[PDB]
Amino acid sequence: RPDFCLEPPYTGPCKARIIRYFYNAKAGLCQTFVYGGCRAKRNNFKSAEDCMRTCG
Amino acid sequence: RPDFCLEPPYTGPCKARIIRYFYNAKAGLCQTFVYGGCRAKRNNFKSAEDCMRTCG
Amino acid sequence: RPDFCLEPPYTGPCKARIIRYFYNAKAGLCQTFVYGGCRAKRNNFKSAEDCMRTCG
Amino acid sequence: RPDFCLEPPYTGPCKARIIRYFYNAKAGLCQTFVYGGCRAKRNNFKSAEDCMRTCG
Amino acid sequence: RPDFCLEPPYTGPCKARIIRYFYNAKAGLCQTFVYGGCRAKRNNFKSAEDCMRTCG
Amino acid sequence: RPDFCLEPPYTGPCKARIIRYFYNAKAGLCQTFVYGGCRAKRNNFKSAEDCMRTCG
Amino acid sequence: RPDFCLEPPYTGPCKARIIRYFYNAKAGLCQTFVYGGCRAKRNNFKSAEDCMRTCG
Amino acid sequence: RPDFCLEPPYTGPCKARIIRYFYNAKAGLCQTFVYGGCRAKRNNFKSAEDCMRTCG
Amino acid sequence: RPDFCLEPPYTGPCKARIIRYFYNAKAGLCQTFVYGGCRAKRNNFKSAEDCMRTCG
Amino acid sequence: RPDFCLEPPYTGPCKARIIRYFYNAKAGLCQTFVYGGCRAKRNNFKSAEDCMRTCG
């Protein structure tokens, strides 16, 4: 499991309201969060499948 | 049918306005509701098929 | 053709702005309308194909 | 090429912010525009493929 | 690699908040940005795959 | 009183949030609404004085 | 002093961020508040002068 | 009438949401458009009066 | 010179981004700052002239 | 012509999007730029008249 999977979800400065998935280390699974649309961090997945496989 | 299927729909504190499905015990079927984007409860399905199969 | 196909489009009390299709009896075809996200009536289709097959 | 392909893009009175394609006669290709969600004119395509084939 | 891949992302005058991808020459990869919905420039991709293949 | 004074307020496809006035036939006076910045209809006044004199 | 001068400031459902003045009965003077752009109440003044004179 | 009056409106790369006027040759009058705030073309007027006098 | 002229600029909890002037005791003149739109402190002037005359 | 007229436009760290004018030495005239709202440099004019008289 990569170092970035432990980062907290980052929304960013943009005004969009898109659902993205992030790995919640404490909960042990991927959850949803609102992404602003720009300047994303590595713990930001468009696909839930990708999130679990990468940070599983 | 799981206990969580009897829970009322939970929008959450987030700003997004995404359509999700929840099981309406009183009506006997899955209906739509607006999900905020974060902190979802279990009675929250992205797919209607999933909702009717799980709480059917 | 079901009697609900003659009902006018219902947006509902919710804040979302989703495109849904409804059958316009006067025009003879399905058209688009903005669905609020909750408490939908029968003349509300996610798919245009479904709308024109059901109320065709 | 149908004459409606020469119409200017019509957003309509509705509140939604949907991307639709319209044929730009001057530019010679289909471009994007924001559709309101209701009362669409003919030069309004959900699919870019459809737009280019119809007004190509 | 086409010259347009070096252009900065262009949101445009429209109200929509759509996620599109653009090539960030400095970073060496495609990133997300909010597209307004109309009058797009060339460094604007609907698909991330397309962005990377074109400006890779 | 011109026929256009009976039209509903039209925000348009643009991103700006400008206050403009429109004549509300039902209420009998001019009210405010948010204009997007482009492709305005006739029932759109920069000045409240103008609105009331034209559609009074 | 009119009855409406005792109403609390109303922002409304619109997305603009305009400065308007309202009479604060408790403080004894007009103060600023953010008006959304539509569906205003009577305790909403564009001009501070007007606010004090009307509810003074 | 100067030839720049035939140019299409240019918003520019900047983030602001300012209303400016441009001459619409096809319509025969000045209309509004959203200016980004920097790198303005010639067909960009702060004043509507100026626009109609210059490109009238 | 009033005591309040020595206070630091107060943006407040509101969403607007209005330019206001405040007296900078250290610099010896009025400067600009972003006011949120509500709950303003005394070192907040709409007019620069007023700021320099009051705290001059 | 003052030495500050040769400085490049400074937006600053603030979130506002105000149009200000700056002298472009290379172009020989004042142009527009987006000012953030705080910590302005000398080549920043609220009025275009002022800009061209000071750095003319």
C9: DSSP letter: P
Chain centroid, CA G13 distance in Å: 16
CA E46 to chain centre: 8
**CB contact burial F19-56 (16+ within 10 A = b; e otherwise):** bbbbbbeeeeebebbbbbbbbbeebbbbebeebeebbe
The 3-state secondary structure of C18-42 reads EEEEEEECCCCEEEEEEECCCCCCC
Dihedral sign computed on CA atoms, order C36, C40, C43, C45: positive
SS (H, E, C) I1-56: CCHHHHCCCCCCCCCCCEEEEEEECCCCEEEEEEECCCCCCCCCECCHHHHHHHCC
- Residue in B44, D17, A13 with CA at minimum distance from that of residue C16: D17
**DSSP track, H1-56:** --GGGGSPP---S----EEEEEEETTTTEEEEEEE-SSS--SS-BS-HHHHHHH--
CB of A14 less than 8 A from some CB of E: yes
Whether A36 and A12 have beta carbons less than 8 Å apart is answered as: yes
Say if residue D5 is exposed, middle or buried (CB neighbours under 10 Å; 0-12, 13-18, 19+).
middle
Q: Which residues pair with F30 in a beta bridge?
A: F23
User: Which of J19, J31, J33 minimises the CB distance to H18?
Assistant: J19
Tokens of H48: 């509507």
The answer to whether C55 and C9 have CB atoms below 8 angstroms apart is no
Q: Which residue of I has its CA nearest to G24?
A: I39
Q: Does D13 contact C at CB distance below 8 Å?
A: no
The conformation of residue J45, written as its DSSP 8-state character, comes to B
Chain F residues closer than 8 Å to H19 by CB: 16, 18, 37
In chain E, residues with a C-beta closer than 8 Å to the C-beta of D33 are: 14, 37-38
Determine, for residues F37 and H19 on separate chains, whether the beta-carbon distance falls below 8 Å.
Answer: yes
Output the CA–CA distances (angstroms, integers) from residue B49 to B7, B22, B55, F49, G51, in the order listed. Answer: 18, 11, 10, 56, 57
Say yes or no: A17 contacts chain E, CB-CB below 8 A: yes
Q: A32 and chain B: CB distance < 8 Å anywhere?
A: yes
By the CB < 8 Å criterion, does H18 face chain J? Answer: yes
What is the rounded CA–CA span in Å between residue B49 and residue H26?
51
Q: Which pair of structure tokens corresponds to residue J2?
A: 């003052």
Residue tagged 């698909």 (tokens): E47
Q: Which helix (H) or strand (E) holds D21?
A: strand D18-24
What is the rounded CA–CA span in Å between residue A22 and residue A42? 9
Strands (E), B1-56: 18-24, 29-35
What is chain D's percent helix, strand, coil content, to nearest 5?
Answer: 20, 25, 55
- According to DSSP, residue A8 is labeled P
Q: How far out from the chain centre does Cα G41 lie? A: 8
Nearest-angstrom CA–CA distance, I4 and I42: 6
A19 in B contact zone (CB under 8 Å):
yes
- Cα dihedral E38→E43→E47→E50 (10° resolution): 140
Our CA-based measurement puts residue I11 at a distance from the nearest CA of chain G, in whole angstroms, of 13
Resolution (A): 2.8
| Residues listed for chain B | 56
Given its phi and psi angles, is residue A12 left (phi above 0), alpha (psi -120 to 50 degrees) or beta? left
> Residues of A with CB below 8 A from E31's CB?
38-40
Integer CA distances (angstroms), H6 to C24, D11, F39, in order: 42, 24, 18
Experimental method: X-ray
Two tokens, residue A23: 């790995």
By C-alpha distance, which of G35, G34, G27 is closest to G52?
G27
- Which residue, B9, B6, B13, B14, is CA-closest to B41? B9
CA angle F44, I19, G14 (to 5 degrees): 40
Query: C47 touching D, CB under 8 A?
Result: no
Using only C-alpha atoms, what is the Rg of chain C? Answer: 10
Q: What is the dihedral of CA E21, E27, E29, E32, to 10 degrees?
A: -20
From B21, B50, B18, select the one nearest B37 (Cα to Cα).
Answer: B18
Are H13 and E10 inside 8 Å of each other by CB? Answer: yes
List, in order of start, the domains of chain J with CATH numbers: 1-56 (4.10.410.10)
Q: Which residue in the set G17, G31, G32 is minimally distant from I15, CB to CB?
A: G17
Question: Is E21 buried (19+), middle (13-18) or exposed (0-12) by CB count in 10 A?
Answer: buried
| Closest-approach residue (CA) in chain J for I16 | J16
Question: F12 is written with which tokens?
Answer: 């348009």
Asked if J16's CB is within 8 angstroms of I19's CB, the reply is yes
Tokens of A39: 């300047």
Helix (H) / strand (E) containing F31: strand F29-35
In one letter, which amino acid is J40?
A
> Tokens 């100026």 map to which residue?
H50
Q: Is C19 at the interface with chain B, CB within 8 A?
A: no
Task: Tell whether the torsion through CA atoms of H28, H32, H34 and H39 is positive or negative.
Answer: positive
